[PDB]
Amino acid sequence: TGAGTPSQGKKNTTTHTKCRRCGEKSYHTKKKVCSSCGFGKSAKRRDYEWQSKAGE
Amino acid sequence: SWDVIKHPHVTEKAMNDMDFQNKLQFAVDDRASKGEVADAVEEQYDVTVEQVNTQNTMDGEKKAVVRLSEDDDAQEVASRI
Amino acid sequence: GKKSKATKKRLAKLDNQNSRVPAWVMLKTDRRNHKRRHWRRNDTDE
Amino acid sequence: TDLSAQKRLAADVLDVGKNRVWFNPERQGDIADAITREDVRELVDEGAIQAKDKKGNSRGRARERQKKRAYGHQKGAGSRKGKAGARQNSKEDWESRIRAQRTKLRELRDEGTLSSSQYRDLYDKAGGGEFDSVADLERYIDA
Amino acid sequence: ERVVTIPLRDARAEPNHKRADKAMILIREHLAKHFSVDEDAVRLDPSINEAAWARGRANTPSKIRVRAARFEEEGEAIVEAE
RNA sequence: UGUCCCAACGUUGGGCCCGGUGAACUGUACAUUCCAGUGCGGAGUCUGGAGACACCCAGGGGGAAGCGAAGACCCUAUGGA
RNA sequence: AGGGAAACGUGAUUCAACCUGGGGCCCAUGAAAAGACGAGCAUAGUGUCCGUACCGAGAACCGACACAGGUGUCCAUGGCGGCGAAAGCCAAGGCCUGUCGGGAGCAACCAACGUUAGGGAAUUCGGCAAGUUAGUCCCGUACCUUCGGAAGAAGGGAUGCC
RNA sequence: GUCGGGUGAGAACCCCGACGGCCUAAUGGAUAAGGGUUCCUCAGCACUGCUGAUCAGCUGAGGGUUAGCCGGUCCUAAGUC
RNA sequence: GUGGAAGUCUGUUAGAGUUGGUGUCCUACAAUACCCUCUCGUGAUCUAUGUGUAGGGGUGAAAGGCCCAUCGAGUCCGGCA
RNA sequence: UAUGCCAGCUGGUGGAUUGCUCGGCUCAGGCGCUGAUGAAGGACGUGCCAAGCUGCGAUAAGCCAUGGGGAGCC
Ligand SMILES: [Cl-]
Ligand SMILES: [Cl-]
Ligand SMILES: [Mg+2]
Ligand SMILES: [Mg+2]
Ligand SMILES: [Mg+2]
Ligand SMILES: [Mg+2]
Ligand SMILES: [Mg+2]
Ligand SMILES: [Mg+2]
Ligand SMILES: [Mg+2]
Ligand SMILES: [Mg+2]
Ligand SMILES: [Mg+2]
Ligand SMILES: [Mg+2]
Ligand SMILES: [Mg+2]
Ligand SMILES: [Mg+2]
Ligand SMILES: [Mg+2]
Ligand code: NA
Ligand code: NA
Ligand code: NA
Ligand code: NA
Ligand code: NA
Ligand code: NA
Ligand code: NA
Ligand code: NA
Ligand code: NA
Ligand code: NA
Ligand code: NA
Ligand SMILES: [Sr+2]
Ligand SMILES: [Sr+2]
Ligand SMILES: [Sr+2]
Ligand SMILES: [Sr+2]
Ligand SMILES: [Sr+2]
Ligand SMILES: [Sr+2]
Ligand SMILES: [Sr+2]
Ligand SMILES: [Sr+2]
Ligand SMILES: [Sr+2]
Ligand SMILES: [Sr+2]
Ligand SMILES: [Sr+2]
Ligand SMILES: [Sr+2]
Ligand SMILES: [Sr+2]
Ligand SMILES: [Sr+2]
Ligand SMILES: [Sr+2]
Ligand SMILES: [Sr+2]
Ligand SMILES: [Sr+2]
Ligand SMILES: [Sr+2]
Ligand SMILES: [Sr+2]
Ligand SMILES: [Sr+2]
Ligand SMILES: [Sr+2]
Ligand SMILES: [Sr+2]
Ligand SMILES: [Sr+2]
Ligand SMILES: [Sr+2]
Ligand SMILES: [Sr+2]
Ligand SMILES: [Sr+2]
Ligand SMILES: [Sr+2]
Ligand SMILES: [Sr+2]
Ligand SMILES: [Sr+2]
């Protein structure tokens, strides 16, 4: 069984969903953690300086 | 403060329920319960509500099918608005 | 699947948005729903 | 005219598969105006819409074969496909036989014909596979 | 109006599983020619259809007696079995 | 026992002609070539001859050191893992 | 009551479901909790909230596609057949959308495939490819063996219909 | 698939009948996930559809999902916070 | 004779797999497909859903295999021009 | 003279060029905290007809008062 097309058919699991806090479809319904805003992980909002060029 | 009755839901299927089963249909606030719909309807058109069925529609609203008692005539009620 | 009340509200909103720009808006602006979606060609969120 | 919706209502009102409903070729116009199920029932009573009969496979040729075989024919080596034990379950056969031999021995005993002592001796022999059949058992009892 | 016998031996040129079809064509071409009319004007009565398809799509009769009538302003033909 | 001697005939789908639909690869330029030679020694394009009226259809692929991929081999780099 | 145009059966066999027992196995031991029973009867009232369409696939899902791929469950008792949930044929039911057609006895060439005289592996690295054999019953069965097996060894015969 | 016919400005492929076929653990019936209105009706054919199209999963406009006793909801499992 | 054991045999039962054709395909139906042949099919079996293990770390009946078409060290953005 | 070569003409295709600027970019000065009295952000609503943006919040492109403003406005 190939890793390509044939294995794409088994994908019918729901993981990332609309997030209650930020509105993005990044709330992982299995981990109960938003990969976009950190909801479920931290009270503070997920943020990182590498999300932009260093001197900006 | 949100009100219970939004407006009469008027469609072919609604008219039938009104002519054949003495039922009135309304678009109502989706936070309303069957009981709150019965009470609201009785106090707006002065009638007796026997049963209320509900459905959260694909229009984001709640539809209620209110059956009046045999003393009240759906057709006549609906016709005065 | 099984939709929750909220999911259903969001789906309904998406259905509503998925409509034509009223004809009068054309005249008034003297001459496109850029968000027109198709159930098959597109994929909604959640 | 396009009558496929009417075909679906008809199959439901006549309670049959759509493939079995028949629409009179000369009434496409009237059937075409049929909107409601009542419009369909109406046309049905008029005979404009009818349900074609369903088929059942004839079992005649089968029955004749069933008779030859019940009579012992058409079962020569050339007609067998399954292994012997598959044509007759051996354990099943033994159950049939041994039960028949025990019912026999039990009747002879209540009927006083066998002392519980001769009965015991024959019972243990049957259970030990001494007799091929009932007749074989009787032949043995007759010394 | 007259009775004619159509030879369908040329259906053998078409693949075996579709001879019935080719036959129905040969019939129309034969009548069109012998009755001096356009093929589009030749009308084949279902009786002829059922005759050619009798043994399925692969087994056509080698010939077929056909009764055909000719008439009208534009010129047409109407045919059926016998 | 058609693997072979040694191939034949037949079947179905294509192929071919017609209606409709309708891409891609590839393209420095010129280009009807062939035989020799020459040239960075492996030329349709240079030299000498030979041949060569234009266009189109079908074909199997000799050549364009054919197209596809900045050689996985080899070496080199005060390269990487 | 309902349903059927009508009749609106009666017995039997084999018996999925479901019920209840007996036996055997483990250097393997085959969940838990809420709840229920234990603990009667009448009448009345209450029983809110969320889901409910449709597809479920050679066009509704994932694979950029109306993709020959991938994708769980139950229908496992429809008829003949036969050991069979096998093949083949046929019902109930579904379909002509594994969706471009028209024409040429329709050439070469290619993909699948049928039939080939005599020779019979000479072909090839190699029997690759194809073929040969075949189901069931009876007879019969070597070396070797860890005594289980080898074994369907091999070899021989039979096979329908009435 | 074929012969007739229906509708339409227009019909090989939209519909009716007949004849001829295909599917039998599936090409039938009910569904899980997932999709999200694709479901039904009317009116359409510029777009989408391996050709055409009067058809449609396409376009326009409306409509459609009703529960004490079917799921959720309650319990706890590996395990998570 | 009974009994009915077996990482037991035959078997396109369901289901799992893939020896050969170095067949078809190779701008594909498909960025791993199609057909025939072949292997397993009561168990160290197959399978659905849930759940756990995370990047010099997992997982591995060990092939440097697998960890979302990529693995002798994933992916994303940043260091970074 | 067909197939055809080079250049131009008329008409297309295409959107270069020239002109234009509701947007950018950089500099300078000023100013500078918000939130449990629930912020920032998001969701879903809200219009006669209303999909998008903007506004607003079941009092929903808006309600009240004071001053400005003015014969138009939505
Ligand atoms: Cl027992
Ligand atoms: Cl449910
Ligand atoms: Mg409900
Ligand atoms: Mg709509
Ligand atoms: Mg036994
Ligand atoms: Mg045929
Ligand atoms: Mg290089
Ligand atoms: Mg090397
Ligand atoms: Mg190094
Ligand atoms: Mg298709
Ligand atoms: Mg020969
Ligand atoms: Mg040799
Ligand atoms: Mg071989
Ligand atoms: Mg229509
Ligand atoms: Mg699992
Ligand atoms: Na409303
Ligand atoms: Na979608
Ligand atoms: Na051959
Ligand atoms: Na060549
Ligand atoms: Na059977
Ligand atoms: Na078609
Ligand atoms: Na024994
Ligand atoms: Na294989
Ligand atoms: Na790493
Ligand atoms: Na400031
Ligand atoms: Na708007
Ligand atoms: Sr494997
Ligand atoms: Sr596959
Ligand atoms: Sr899955
Ligand atoms: Sr946490
Ligand atoms: Sr941060
Ligand atoms: Sr609606
Ligand atoms: Sr898709
Ligand atoms: Sr020259
Ligand atoms: Sr060629
Ligand atoms: Sr029994
Ligand atoms: Sr349903
Ligand atoms: Sr289904
Ligand atoms: Sr499939
Ligand atoms: Sr049938
Ligand atoms: Sr089509
Ligand atoms: Sr022959
Ligand atoms: Sr040899
Ligand atoms: Sr040799
Ligand atoms: Sr033999
Ligand atoms: Sr047109
Ligand atoms: Sr439809
Ligand atoms: Sr086994
Ligand atoms: Sr190989
Ligand atoms: Sr082969
Ligand atoms: Sr390949
Ligand atoms: Sr096996
Ligand atoms: Sr078994
Ligand atoms: Sr990978
Ligand atoms: Sr960088």
- Calpha distance B7→B24 (Å, rounded): 11
- Calpha distance B21→B17 (Å, rounded): 5
CATH of the domain at B70: 3.30.70.330
- Calpha distance D126→D22 (Å, rounded): 68
Both ends of chain A: CA-CA distance in Å?
47
**Residue B18 domain boundaries:** 1-81
- C11 contacts B56? CB cut-off 8 A: no
CB D19 within 8 A of CB D53: no
- Calpha distance E66→E68 (Å, rounded): 6
Task: For domain A1-56, give the fold.
Answer: N-terminal domain of TfIIb (2.20.25)
Q: Which residue is nearest to nucleotide G83 (CA to C1')?
A: D82
Radius of gyration, alpha carbons of chain E: 12
**Residue E3 domain boundaries:** 1-82
Is A22 annotated to bind a ligand? Reply is: yes
- Residues contacting residue B3 through CB under 8 Å, at least 6 positions apart: B29, B40
- Calpha distance B60→D100 (Å, rounded): 75
- Residues contacting residue D2 through CB under 8 Å, at least 6 positions apart: D32
- Calpha distance D83→D86 (Å, rounded): 5
Which chain C residues are within 8 Å of B31, Cβ to Cβ? none
CB D14 within 8 A of CB D44: yes
Q: Is the CB of B48 under 7 A from strand G?
A: no
**Residue C29 domain boundaries:** 1-46
Q: Is the CB of A7 under 7 A from strand G?
A: yes
Top CATH class, D56-88: mainly alpha
Helix (H, G, I), strand (E, B) or coil at E62: coil
CB E47 within 8 A of CB E80: yes
CB atoms within 10 A of CB D58: 8
Is A19 annotated to bind a ligand? Reply is: yes
Instruction: State both tokens at D82.
Output: 């399954």
CB atoms within 10 A of CB D116: 9
Q: What separation in Å is there between the alpha carbon of C26 and the centre of ligand 26?
A: 13
- Residues contacting residue B36 through CB under 8 Å, at least 6 positions apart: B4
Which chains neighbour D (Cβ–Cβ under 8 Å, 3 or more pairs)? Answer: none
Resolution, in Å, please?
Answer: 2.2
Q: What separation in Å is there between the alpha carbon of D46 and the centre of ligand 16?
A: 45
Nucleic strand I contacts from chain A, 3-32, CB < 7 Å = 3-8, 10-13, 15, 30
CATH of region D1-55: 1.10.1650.10
- Calpha distance A9→E30 (Å, rounded): 56
Q: What separation in Å is there between the alpha carbon of E17 and the centre of ligand 21?
A: 21
Domain count, chain E: 1
Domain boundaries, chain A: 1-56
CATH of region D89-143: 1.10.1200.60
Residues in chain E, overall count:
82
How remote is the C-alpha of D39 from its chain's centroid? 43
Which residue is associated with the tokens 């999300």?
A51
Q: What distance separates the 2 farthest-apart alpha carbons in chain A?
A: 48
CATH of the domain at E71: 3.10.440.10
Domain count, chain C: 1
Domain count, chain B: 1
